[PDB]
Design a protein around this ligand. Structure first.
Ligand SMILES: Nc1ncnc2c1ncn2[C@@H]1O[C@H](COP(=O)(O)OP(=O)(O)O)[C@@H](O)[C@H]1O
Lengths: 483, 477, 490, 499
């Protein structure tokens, strides 16, 4: 039993250092020898060889937390490790393993109703670009560097604010065309599906287009074989060019007589598609995957509207746009020098836009950064002495676990945790809810979080304090496996 | 090194505490010790365990040493100080693992100490002065669950007369009591009812040829440590002059010429009690031999052959501060325990002379200071808050060990006890040491006196701050 | 393995300071000092820790005597002269590993200490003058901080600086001396410490000699003795004839340290004298030297003029205590604050806080040239010797900075022992002493040091936290003397 | 036997790993840096003094070393030289911040202090930046020739380096379209004195057996161009000889029909068949380098061919003139006279063989220095004077700021000082005197006192025209700080093997 919660403690400790906006990034040289200098907990959890079975419940609860808000994973891990760390103290006091379960359940049910009573929600809409750019600041502020978020919150928001329309949203439409080279300031916004191409013979102002679909990319007897191959690729590009295609796509490289054919019929020779856009370009234009050059027809065809060349990001790229939604797809172009920061920027983008998605359905915003956690830590520990019996222990061991969350925010910022926790707990008694932990001060100084703007989603905390408690309870109710 | 050997200090202090943890209270489990020779000895008394036991660590030695200073002042409870220091020292390391200094910990411990000395005086119930019924209740609380329960009916009187004959009116009204002037004489032979009290000092020794002008109706005792000086004495003419060496019968007649009675082979616990009961003095230098020579002492000398023994009673004395208590019987195993527990009770009724307060023990005083310090912990902020609260709940092992060694569970019992102590503020309930049930200790009657438990709590806090003050033992191992 | 015996000596000398590091300052911890005979030792000061330590390494044994050479000058500073010299060895070994010769580091240290004392002698204080008194007031308030005297301790501070300066002895060379046992503790039962007052003499709480002496018996000639004036049977019957032989010589206030005279109060209206039992020698000798008297065990013999001067012996009630008012004497060895309270036991730590204030006030009085406390001299010197080092350009240039980086260990230690983080306090002292140099208008910003009780930046010239300049100067001399020897040893 | 995978052991292992890879490139800093020899393993001896030429050919096994060698790879893509300086500076940042970490200070604090110190330094470098453009550098160009003189000043080569300075300013000025190392090659010629060198306006290549066919080609020709062929030219048992004879016939007739002056190929032509492929009736060439392939197509413009009688429009199209001359005795290829002339090749006419190494160490940065002094004008001094001024500024900024960063910014300060300390150690002087006498008059007199590489005494590199580009130093110390805080921010390295 104690070995299980010890495995949960070390699983909490390996992600506690990567918590908050000053998370220490870890190095991943994985099974197939990657190289990630990364900070997101779901990236590390999907790489770590979780061998102990009791920690797999914690990993699965964090994965379920990822599956519906996209964030709050490290919060679930830290809170569950804190609950089990205080649970072993409760067990070594002399409480049963049953009593801690319903104590945690009662205090979690109390937290689930105290949590909507501290909200400072969003103002009017997920429109008004400059208002919701500040609302998306906290997500990438936690992940990437804070001084970088001032451009990055705008770049991540002005593209995602294209379609906050008719009460429905999709996060898959926000893509990234990862283009290397110039700095992060050179990043820009694009409206439609974008990737680089090679050639130039593009008809631009097309109607509802006719898109080629590729699921698989590319003495006189010698001259006769040459003419045979010549008319062979001619009939091949005609087998696409019949039924009137405007573009010819391929995942690979150019061919010289084939590009002369694509200039002869005036077709855009699209090249160099990824091993992931083969589904995504089919999804956006209504295309069905075709292996070779011979078997397209008019029924076997995609339908964009405007395919031409753009030079934003200082590089020639394609554009696919104006679908049934007429603005369904809206990628972003992310410019960096190397790749080892660009994966973190990419994993910050979607973790910003899923918070935008949960803001479509939950406008409630709680003050984050120690404000909510110390408030719950005070409320439940004031509830704890009210109900007598053995649960009076366990409820008081619940809210104290909430104090482990700003402590992990404290010690990740070079701050003495006991001083800042005592100071925050004292100032929360009178200078109420909206105060929390300041990051920038080396001195353990508190700061009001509402005027700082550092607020989190209410539904994320609401689901996270449910799933972490469920994980801790379902871990505490096992004894062993023969192993 | 440093905090590592500080943790080693508190570990070496805690291990000797859990050695003697279970053996407090009236249901004490017996700790057995073997030598590397074959001596197999079982006991309950914690001090008896502390005497033989060796410790390889100087921190544990000093922790033992301050309790060794504690034993000879107010008496027992020396297991309680070694217990109650250890939990504070163990709970201090949880903040020493929080990278906070020993200084904030010991200042929080001192801030708990000044609270604990006050809150015990809040819950102090006044016993009345020298009223024999609650004086019997003092015997009922302090002297029972021992081997005196068939002979405490005499010990209740032996307490009450001895405390009234060891008083000292130095700065005020009779305030200092003492246990070294009460003239105990524990001789076997006869029934234990022959153990009697009287005013004065008995002396086992006598002159070897008692054809002397020996007993005079107002013996004025001069001490000495020569017939020319015997001639020189007769300026003021005292009637007795005390030596310690042998007096021949010719020298006895020559002292009869002076009319003074000397004495031989007398002990020093005899001699200082002789001088204490009478106000003796000593001088033989002739220009210091003045009006200031003779200590006007007793009102009766008495050659008495008590138990065929050459007794001399210096009784009806000057100062009622060294007075007779005989101790008779068959063997010498229980009136020694009577003497021990009644010198502890002598300090008890010394407290009754000064602060006559009987606070409910059995952890009820401990639960009261615990609750009254937890509620005071709610207002205070700063880093010293958590250690200050820690000794709020580190010290409650006095019920927790006592509920441990009586069969009942500790968890539900202590949780229900604090449940009937926090919101039930004016109750002061304690765990009964027999059935393991939460009773009103005021209804049960087991009241520990205030000053002795104040001394134990203070000495425990001093032990804690002494150990945490220690940094390193670098002069050897 | 093992190499560079200089580094072996550096580690051996560094271990000695690592023992006595956390003991620096009044909030220092305790070092258990145990030989295997069984005995323990509980002590906080580096002097006896350095003395009774069974020291092992021979190169480290060069330290304990050189710091003992600090002991025979002023006493304390023995810990700091170990700590500073060990940090000098630590930085000097790092300089040695950069192929800088130990001769060059030693010559740089020898330039640095002379430049440091030249910097110190242009920035010390003599402001604690005859009219500079409130500095002594809050300097006494430093000795009684965080105590319950603090609301009456200003009223105590006025009377205690009036105690020490009025009792002051102009010595044989003219410099003022304070005998510490001259003014002494003296309890009074009854009302609390709100009313305790300095009396300009001693006033003994023993048996009353006489009301027969007048309210100001103008020439109190102290005919003190040791006998008890009791009759036996120019006297053998020792009550009168010796004291009458000296009494015709103008013996004004007879004192009998033993018993009283039998015809006492009748001789006490023609002489105006006393007979007080148990006159302790703390007050008997310090009324003898207060007046210039002679105590006569035997008296049969001159004895006219050597019964020294006092001006009046008052017979009144002082806080439920008629006292023996040996007061207004020839020399000022007679003063006592009548400690009103219950005993010397209810105000025991209170009279401790009243006595230690005297001996911490006396330190600035001897050798009136003074520097601030709180380690601010070391912070100012680290500011100083940095820019002094950057002017050199020789091979000693890296030495003096390693001098200046070493000296700030004394605020670095005191920040640790006062339960603070050691970085920010020393950094704040360095920042505050920057504008003591780089800003010409704020020259009155030098005196910011660490408070030894809390560990925070705080003025010391305004607060009285001071140190005699010869202590700082000679400790900085002897630290370099300890550094140069062990750096030469290889 | 030492196990180090906990957090403080993690960072200690990481900084030992950066220290060893810094020692792998420590001695190569500066113009006269010590050479390092590595092999491939099979006998391909490579002596190098460059950093990335060492570092790419080096091995790297460690995680933190791999996540700094990427920054090292990023620094060579700008200009090349300077990759050792940024890595050595970041390693000295880590070695100076070393004793503060295990004493108990937080890595995010020292990272933030590094960032603030970097922002302060990149501020202070901008104010001391001096432009030198209109002080007669392109018109009356001789002062820009003067910094062209800074490559080999006051040597026995310096008299010939007057001609080399004039020709390097010509090799920059005549071709400035953001010039590269590719557009200007150097060609070694044995024999003669070093003064007899040249800078030709075109390509230059020695001809060997498999290289080129026969002399007496149309040298003085109005428009001599190139066929760029990828087919060979060289020479059933009765039905296999006549087909080869016919192929010989049509490949002979291709030269008449297509009209190619010199056919170019990556395929061998027979010089044992010299007149036999002069019986191709024209010149040809084979086994071509890629610099010849570019600089005669991107600059001259010779078209590329495919078949038996492959005619094109640029086998005798517009180039200026052909040349084939005994330069130093040996006749060389010259498809000189390029209409798109980003091609002027240096012709190292000289006696000794290892002076090729001397010129490819000394004039391979002189092209960079001169084309940068044209490209950048806001420049600063070198020789470690700029790091010394930033170290003085940040030494002031440390003690004038309260808080724990004061010890770190000074740690940011002294860590700069190994940049000239490694320089003089690569020169040979004592670092201690050359640093102390530097810092004294640097803190008293002025800023741009720097370390001279020749006499090893403190000089004024601003007056010796030793210009360092301000933007290059900005990117250098920015990348040094970034590679510092990346390794400092790294604690955990999760492995998760195969098995
Ligand atoms: N600048 C900041 N100031 C205060 N708190 C912050 C800041 N940035 C992030 N946080 C807090 O860190 C907490 C954890 O976020 P994190 O777990 O890193 O998100 P994710 O689960 O997407 O990685 C959030 O609840 C947020 O309140």
């Amino acid at each position: 039993v104690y070995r299980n919660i010890q495995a949960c403690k070390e699983l909490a400790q390996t992600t506690r250092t990567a918590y908050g906006p000053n998370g220490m990034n870890k190095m991943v040289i994985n099974h197939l020898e990657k190289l990630f200098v990364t900070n997101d907990a779901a990236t590390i959890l999907r790489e770590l060889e979780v061998q102990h079975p009791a920690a797999k419940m914690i990993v699965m609860a964090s994965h379920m937390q990822e599956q519906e808000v996209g964030d709050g994973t490290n919060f679930v891990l830290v809170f569950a490790g804190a609950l089990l760390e205080l649970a072993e103290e409760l067990l070594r006091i002399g409480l049963s393993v049953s009593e801690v379960i319903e104590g945690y359940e009662i205090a979690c049910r109390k937290a689930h109703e105290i949590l909507p009573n501290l909200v400072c929600c969003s103002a009017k809409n997920l429109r008004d670009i400059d208002e919701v750019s500040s609302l998306l600041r906290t997500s990438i502020m936690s992940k990437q560097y804070g001084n970088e978020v001032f451009l990055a919150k705008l770049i991540a928001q002005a593209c995602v604010s294209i379609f906050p329309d008719s009460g429905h949203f999709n996060v898959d439409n926000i893509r990234v065309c990862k283009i290397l080279g110039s700095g992060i300031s050179s990043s820009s916004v694009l409206h439609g599906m974008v990737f680089k191409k090679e050639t130039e013979g593009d008809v631009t102002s097309v109607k509802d287009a006719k898109i080629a679909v590729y699921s698989c990319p590319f003495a006189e007897e010698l001259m006769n074989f040459s003419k045979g191959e010549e008319n062979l690729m001619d009939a091949q590009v005609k087998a696409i060019a019949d039924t009137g295609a405007n573009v010819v796509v391929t995942g690979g490289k150019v061919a010289d007589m084939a590009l002369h054919y694509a200039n002869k019929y005036n077709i855009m020779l699209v090249r160099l598609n990824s091993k992931w856009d083969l589904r995504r370009l089919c999804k956006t234009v209504g295309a069905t995957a075709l292996p070779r050059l011979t078997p397209p027809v008019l029924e076997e065809m995609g339908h964009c509207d405007s395919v031409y060349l753009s030079e934003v990001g200082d590089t020639q790229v394609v554009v696919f746009k104006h679908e049934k939604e007429d603005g369904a797809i809206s990628t972003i172009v992310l410019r960096g020098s190397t790749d080892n920061l660009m994966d973190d920027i990419e994993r910050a983008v979607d973790d910003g836009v899923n918070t935008f998605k949960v803001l479509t359905r939950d406008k409630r915003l709680v003050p984050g950064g120690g404000a909510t956690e110390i408030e719950l830590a005070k409320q439940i520990t004031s509830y704890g002495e009210t109900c007598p019996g053995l649960e009076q222990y366990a409820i008081k061991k619940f809210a104290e676990a909430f104090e482990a969350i700003p402590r992990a925010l404290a010690e990740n910022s070079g701050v003495k945790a006991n001083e800042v926790i005592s100071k925050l707990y004292a100032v929360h008694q009178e200078g109420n809810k909206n105060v929390g932990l300041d990051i920038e001060a080396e001195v353990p100084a508190v700061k009001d979080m509402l005027e700082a703007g550092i607020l989190d989603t209410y539904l994320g905390k609401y689901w996270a304090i449910k799933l972490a408690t469920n994980a801790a309870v379902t871990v505490l109710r096992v004894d062993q496996i023969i192993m | 090194s440093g905090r590592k050997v500080q943790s080693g200090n508190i570990n070496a202090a805690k291990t000797i505490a859990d050695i003697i943890r279970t053996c407090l209270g009236p249901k004490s489990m017996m700790k057995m010790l073997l030598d590397p020779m074959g001596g197999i000895v079982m006991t309950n008394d914690g001090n008896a365990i502390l005497r033989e036991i060796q410790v390889q660590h100087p921190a544990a030695k000093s922790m033992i040493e301050i309790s060794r200073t504690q034993d000879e002042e107010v008496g027992d409870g020396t297991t309680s100080v070694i217990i109650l220091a250890g939990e504070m020292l163990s709970v201090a390391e949880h903040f020493l693992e929080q990278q906070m200094h020993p200084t904030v910990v010991i200042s929080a411990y001192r801030k708990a100490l000044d609270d604990m000395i006050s809150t015990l005086k809040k819950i102090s119930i006044p016993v009345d002065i020298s009223d024999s019924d609650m004086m019997l209740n003092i015997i009922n609380s302090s002297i029972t669950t021992k081997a005196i329960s068939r002979w405490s009916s005499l010990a209740c009187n032996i307490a009450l007369d001895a405390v009234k004959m060891v008083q000292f009116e130095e700065n005020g009204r009779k305030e200092i009591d003492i246990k070294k002037y009460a003239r105990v004489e524990k001789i076997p032979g006869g029934i234990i009812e022959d153990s009697c009290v009287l005013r004065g000092v008995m002396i086992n020794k006598d002159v070897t040829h008692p054809r002397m002008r020996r007993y005079i109706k107002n013996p004025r005792i001069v001490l000495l440590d020569i017939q020319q000086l015997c001639e020189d004495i007769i300026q003021l003419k005292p009637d007795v002059v005390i030596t310690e060496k042998g007096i021949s019968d010719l020298a006895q007649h020559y002292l009869m010429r002076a009319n003074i009675t000397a004495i031989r082979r007398v002990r020093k616990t005899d001699n200082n009690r002789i001088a204490r009961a009478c106000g003796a003095r000593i001088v033989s230098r002739p220009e210091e031999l003045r009006e200031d020579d003779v200590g006007t002492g007793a009102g009766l000398l008495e050659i008495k052959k008590i138990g065929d023994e050459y007794f001399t009673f210096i009784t009806d004395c000057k100062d009622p501060k060294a007075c007779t208590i005989l101790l008779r019987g068959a063997s010498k195993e229980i009136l020694s325990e009577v003497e021990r527990n009644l010198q502890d009770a002598m300090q008890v009724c010394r407290n009754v002379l000064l602060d006559p307060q009987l606070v409910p023990g059995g952890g009820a005083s401990e639960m009261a200071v615990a609750h009254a310090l937890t509620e005071k912990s709610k207002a205070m902020t700063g880093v010293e808050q958590w250690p200050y609260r820690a000794v709020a709940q580190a010290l409650e092992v006095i019920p927790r060990t006592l509920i441990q060694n009586c069969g009942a569970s500790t968890i539900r019992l202590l949780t229900s006890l604090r449940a009937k102590h926090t919101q039930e503020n004016c109750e002061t309930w304690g765990v009964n040491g027999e059935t393991g049930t939460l009773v009103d200790m005021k209804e049960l009657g087991i009241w520990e006196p205030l000053a002795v438990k104040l001394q134990t709590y203070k000495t425990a806090v001093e032990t804690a701050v002494l150990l945490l003050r220690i940094d390193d033992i670098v002069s050897g191992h | 393995t093992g190499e560079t015996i200089r580094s072996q000596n550096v580690m051996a000398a560094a271990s000695i300071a690592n023992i006595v590091k956390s003991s620096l300052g009044p909030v220092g911890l305790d070092k258990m000092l145990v030989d295997d005979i069984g005995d323990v030792t509980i002590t906080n000061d580096g002097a006896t820790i350095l003395k009774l330590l069974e020291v092992e390494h021979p190169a480290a044994k060069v330290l304990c005597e050189l710091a003992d050479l600090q002991d025979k000058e002023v006493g304390d500073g023995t810990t700091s002269v170990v700590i500073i010299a060990a940090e000098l060895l630590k930085n000097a070994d790092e300089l040695v590993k950069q192929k800088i010769h130990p001769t060059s580091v030693i010559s740089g240290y020898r330039l640095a200490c002379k430049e440091a004392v030249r910097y110190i002698n242009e920035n010390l204080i003599v402001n604690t003058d005859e009219l500079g008194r409130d500095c002594l007031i809050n300097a006494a308030k430093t000795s009684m901080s965080s105590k319950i005297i603090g609301i009456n301790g200003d009223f105590f501070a006025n009377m205690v600086v009036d105690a020490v300066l009025a009792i002051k002895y102009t010595d044989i060379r003219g410099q003022p001396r304070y005998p510490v046992n001259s003014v002494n503790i003296l309890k009074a039962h009854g009302r609390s410490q709100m009313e305790s007052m300095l009396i300009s003499g001693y006033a003994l709480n023993c048996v009353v000699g006489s009301q027969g002496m007048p309210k100001r018996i103008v020439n109190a000639k102290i005919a003190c003795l040791d006998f008890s004036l009791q009759k036996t049977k120019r006297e053998s019957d020792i009550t009168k004839e010796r004291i009458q032989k000296i009494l015709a010589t103008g013996a004004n206030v007879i004192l009998t340290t033993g018993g009283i005279d039998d015809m006492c109060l009748k001789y006490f209206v023609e002489a105006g004298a006393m007979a007080v039992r148990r006159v302790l020698k703390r007050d008997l000798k310090r009324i003898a030297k207060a007046s210039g008297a002679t105590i006569l065990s035997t008296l049969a013999n001159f004895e006219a003029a050597m019964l020294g001067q006092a001006e009046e012996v008052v017979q009144e009630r002082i806080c439920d205590d008629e006292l023996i008012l040996i007061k207004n004497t020839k020399a000022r060895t007679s003063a006592s604050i009548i400690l009103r309270g219950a005993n010397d036991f209810m105000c025991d730590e209170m009279e401790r806080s009243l006595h230690d204030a005297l001996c911490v006030v006396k330190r600035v009085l001897e050798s009136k040239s003074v520097v601030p406390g709180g380690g601010a001299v070391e912070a100012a010197l680290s500011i100083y010797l940095e820019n002094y080092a950057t002017s050199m350009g020789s091979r000693e240039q890296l030495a003096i900075a390693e001098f200046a980086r070493s000296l700030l260990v004394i605020p670095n230690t005191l920040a640790v022992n006062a339960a603070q983080d050691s970085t920010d306090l020393v950094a704040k002292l360095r920042a505050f002493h920057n504008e003591a140099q780089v800003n010409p208008e704020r020259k009155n910003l030098k005196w910011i040091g660490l408070d030894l009780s809390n560990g925070k930046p705080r003025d010391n010239k305004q607060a009285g936290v001071f140190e005699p300049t010869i202590v700082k100067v000679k400790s900085l001399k002897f630290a370099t003397e300890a550094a140069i020897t062990i750096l030469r040893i290889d | 036997g030492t196990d180090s995978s906990q957090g403080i052991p993690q960072l200690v292992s990481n900084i030992s790993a950066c220290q060893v890879i810094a020692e792998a490139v420590r001695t190569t800093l500066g113009p006269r840096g010590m050479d390092k020899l590595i092999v491939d393993g099979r006998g391909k001896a490579t002596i190098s003094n460059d950093g990335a030429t060492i570092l790419k050919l080096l091995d790297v096994v460690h995680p933190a070393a791999k996540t700094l060698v990427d920054i090292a790879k990023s620094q060579d893509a700008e200009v090349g030289d300077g990759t050792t300086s940024v890595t050595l500076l970041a390693a000295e940042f880590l070695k100076q911040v070393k004793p503060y970490v295990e004493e108990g200070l937080h890595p995010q604090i020292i990272i933030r202090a590094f960032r603030t110190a970097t922002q302060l330094a990149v501020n202070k470098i901008k104010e001391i930046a001096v432009t030198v453009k209109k002080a007669d550098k392109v018109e009356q160009r001789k002062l820009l020739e003067k910094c062209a003189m800074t490559a080999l000043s006051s040597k026995l080569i310096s008299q010939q380096k007057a001609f080399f300075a004039k020709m390097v300013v010509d090799a920059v000025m005549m071709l400035d379209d953001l010039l590269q190392l590719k557009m200007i090659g150097i060609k070694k010629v044995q024999g003669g004195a070093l003064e007899d060198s040249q800078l030709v306006a075109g390509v230059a290549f020695k001809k060997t057996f498999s290289y080129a066919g026969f002399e007496m080609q149309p040298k003085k020709y109005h428009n001599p161009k190139i066929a760029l062929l990828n087919v060979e030219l060289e020479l059933d048992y009765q039905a296999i000889v006549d087909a080869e004879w016919n192929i010989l016939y049509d490949k002979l007739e291709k030269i008449h029909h297509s009209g190619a002056k010199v056919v170019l190929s990556k395929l061998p032509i027979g010089d044992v068949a010299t007149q036999y492929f002069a019986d191709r009736d024209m010149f040809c060439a084979g086994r071509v380098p890629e610099e010849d392939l570019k600089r005669t197509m991107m600059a001259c413009g010779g078209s590329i061919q495919t078949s038996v009688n492959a005619l094109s429009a640029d086998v005798l199209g517009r180039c200026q003139v052909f040349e084939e001359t005994q330069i130093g005795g040996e006749r060389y290829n010259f498809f000189t006279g390029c209409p798109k002339a980003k091609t002027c090749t240096f012709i190292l006419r000289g006696g000794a063989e290892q002076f090729m190494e001397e010129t490819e160490r000394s004039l391979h940065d002189a092209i960079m220095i001169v084309r940068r002094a044209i490209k950048n004008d806001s420049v600063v001094a070198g020789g470690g004077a700029i790091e010394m001024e930033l170290s003085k500024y940040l030494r002031d900024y440390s003690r004038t700021i309260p808080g724990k960063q004061q010890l770190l910014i000074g740690a940011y300060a002294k860590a700069l000082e190994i940049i000239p300390r490694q320089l003089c150690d690569n020169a040979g002087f004592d670092a201690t005197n050359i640093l102390n006498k530097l810092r004294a008059r640097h803190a008293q007199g002025g800023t741009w006192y720097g370390v001279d590489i020749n006499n090893e005494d403190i000089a004024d590199n601003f007056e010796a025209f030793v210009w360092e580009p301000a933007m290059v130093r900005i990117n250098a110390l920015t990348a040094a700080s970034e590679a510092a805080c990346l390794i400092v921010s790294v604690d955990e390295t999760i492995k998760n093997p195969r098995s």
